[PDB]
Amino acid sequence: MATKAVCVLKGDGPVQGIINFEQKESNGPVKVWGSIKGLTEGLHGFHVHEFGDNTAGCTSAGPHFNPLSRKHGGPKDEERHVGDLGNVTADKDGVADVSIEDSVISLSGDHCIIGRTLVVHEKADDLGKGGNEESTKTGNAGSRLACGVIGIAQ
Amino acid sequence: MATKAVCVLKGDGPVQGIINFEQKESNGPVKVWGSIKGLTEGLHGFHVHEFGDNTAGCTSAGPHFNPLSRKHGGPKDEERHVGDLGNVTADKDGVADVSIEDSVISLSGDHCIIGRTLVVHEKADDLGKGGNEESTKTGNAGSRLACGVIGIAQ
Ligand SMILES: CCCC[C@H](C)/C=C(C)/C=C/C(=O)O
Ligand SMILES: [Zn+2]
Ligand SMILES: [Zn+2]
Numbered sequence: 001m002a003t004k005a006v007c008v009l010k011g012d013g014p015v016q017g018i019i020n021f022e023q024k025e026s027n028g029p030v031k032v033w034g035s036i037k038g039l040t041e042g043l044h045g046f047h048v049h050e051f052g053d054n055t056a057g058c059t060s061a062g063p064h065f066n067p068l069s070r071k072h073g074g075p076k077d078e079e080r081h082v083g084d085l086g087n088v089t090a091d092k093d094g095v096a097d098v099s100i101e102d103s104v105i106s107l108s109g110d111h112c113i114i115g116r117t118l119v120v121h122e123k124a125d126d127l128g129k130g131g132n133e134e135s136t137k138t139g140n141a142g143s144r145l146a147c148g149v150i151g152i153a154q
Numbered sequence: 155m156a157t158k159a160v161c162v163l164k165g166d167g168p169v170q171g172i173i174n175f176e177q178k179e180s181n182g183p184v185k186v187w188g189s190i191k192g193l194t195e196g197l198h199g200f201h202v203h204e205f206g207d208n209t210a211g212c213t214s215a216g217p218h219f220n221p222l223s224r225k226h227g228g229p230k231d232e233e234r235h236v237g238d239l240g241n242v243t244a245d246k247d248g249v250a251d252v253s254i255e256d257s258v259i260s261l262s263g264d265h266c267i268i269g270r271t272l273v274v275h276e277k278a279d280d281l282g283k284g285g286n287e288e289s290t291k292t293g294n295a296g297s298r299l300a301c302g303v304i305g306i307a308q
Pocket of ligand 3: 291
């Protein structure tokens with residue numbers, strides 16, 4: 001019944017932010033928006049990972065949320081992880097003003113992302129086009145800069 | 155659905171801990187265990203609040219999770235909030251070795267607490283027996299010392 005969710009991103013370094021999720025219809029897309037600061041200018045992978053487990057920091061969130069056991073892709077690919085939201089772009093001040101609409105993640109059902117972990121990564125997601133085994137798993141997006149558990153919101 | 159959940163508790167002060175949840179059968183009880191350190195010796199209210207919203211620290215989690223619109227009570231009362239897990243006891247070293255079993259919360263379905271916020275409070279929960287308005291809402295457990303969003307665990 002959740003139509004709204006929210007996530008506070010934190011990590012070891014300066015990266016932090018707040019990301020909102022809104023889904024007016026359970027059969028409709030999820031709007032994803034907010035601000036992340038402290039990033040290097042440019043593209044950063046932006047993924048929902050499987051577990052809402054931050055006991056060992058972002059490492060314990062596990063791999064990309066992939067209940068259909070597909071290969072990694074970009075959000076517009078048919079072959080993609082449910083958690084594959086592509087990249088977000090930080091401006092010259094280090095601020096990513098996130099604005100994504102996605103119809104594969106959901107706030108309910110099998111693809112529900114509530115209770116899982118949103119992660120913003122060190123470098124660009126290659127969207128599965130990197131030609132190596134890592135590309136088909138993580139997009140070569142590198143280390144986890146900040147994360148948080150996605151929670152139900154008012 | 156989920157059989158395991160986990161929660162990392164943090165706050166403005168020194169209180170921190172890790173709480174695990176286990177529900178081997180979807181229609182059976184939830185086991186809740188772990189360790190919270192940095193507490194004053196004695197009883198501390200221990201509740202699931204409605205929203206997994208940490209944007210204002212523990213404040214934005216809202217009231218106790220109460221989908222059945224009941225009055226506050228202790229875990230063994232029939233008249234209780236779903237989020238009413240009672241008290242946890244911190245020893246002389248400031249450590250609460252939590253061990254709770256509850257049949258009202260769940261890790262799936264309508265009483266699902268995944269994506270909501272676990273909070274440990276400053277004072278004892280009076281279990282609804284304090285004789286004022288506050289008693290039947292929060293148990294007079296006082297301020298929110300630490301909290302975290304409850305996430306799906308491996
Ligand atoms: C190992 C460094 C590769 C970085 C390359 C110059 C750009 C990439 C991968 C971005 C791709 C994209 O736009 O998705
Ligand atoms: Zn992926
Ligand atoms: Zn209550």
